[PDB]
C-alpha cells in the first residue's frame, strides 16, 4: 500500500522532488555501501536536535531496512519523508518522534523549501533560526 508513498514523486514540491537526491545524497556521504546504516542516523540526528541510542536507531531502520541489516534503501527514504507528514509519530515506544520537515532542513536546508511551505506543517511557535 505505497499509494501516496510511490506517488510522491509527483506530491513533493518544486524543489523538494529536487532536494531529494541531495538530502539522501548527504546521509551516505562517502559510504561504501551507498545506503544509510544506523551509524550515518546519530550523524543526521544530532542535525535535527536527537540524541537516541545506538541499538534505538535500529527499530526506526527495521521499519524500513530492505536486506534487514539495520540499513535503508534510497527510495524508502523519499517514501519516510511524504508519509512523515501525515504519520510524524512511526516510532511509537521510544521518547520522542522524529519529523520529515526536521531531517530535510537538517540535511541540507539551504536550496529551498519554503515553494510550497512544507515547514508549515508544524504551524506553532518556533526559533529565529
Ligand atoms: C533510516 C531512518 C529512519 C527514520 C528516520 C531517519 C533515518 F535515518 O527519521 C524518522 C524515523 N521515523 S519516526 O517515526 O520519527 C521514529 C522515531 C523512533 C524512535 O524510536 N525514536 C525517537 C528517538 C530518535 C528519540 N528520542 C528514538 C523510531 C523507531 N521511529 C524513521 O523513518
Redesign the pocket.
Known amino acids: 500500500g505505497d499509494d501516496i508513498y510511490k506517488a510522491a514523486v509527483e506530491q513533493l514540491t518544486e524543489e523538494q522532488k529536487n532536494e531529494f537526491k541531495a538530502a539522501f545524497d548527504i ?1 551516505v556521504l562517502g559510504a561504501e555501501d551507498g545506503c ?3 551509524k ?2 546519530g550523524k ?2 544530532r542535525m ?1 536536535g ?4 545506538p541499538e ?2 535500529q ?7 530492505e536486506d534487514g541489516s539495520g ?2 534503501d534510497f527510495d ?2 523519499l517514501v ?1 519523508m511524504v ?2 507528514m501525515k ?14 520537515d ?2 530535510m532542513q537538517a540535511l541540507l536546508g539551504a536550496r529551498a523549501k519554503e515553494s510550497l511551505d512544507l515547514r508549515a506543517h508544524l504551524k506553532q511557535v518556533k526559533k529565529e533560526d
Open positions: 546521509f544509510i546504516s544506523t550515518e542516523l543526521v540526528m535535527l536527537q540524541n537516541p541510542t534505538e536507531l527499530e526506526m531502520i527495521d521499519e524500513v531496512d540499513t535503508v524508502e527514504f519516510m508519509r512523515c504519520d510524524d509519530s512511526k516510532g511509537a515506544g521510544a521518547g520522542v518522534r522524529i519529523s520529515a526536521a531531517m
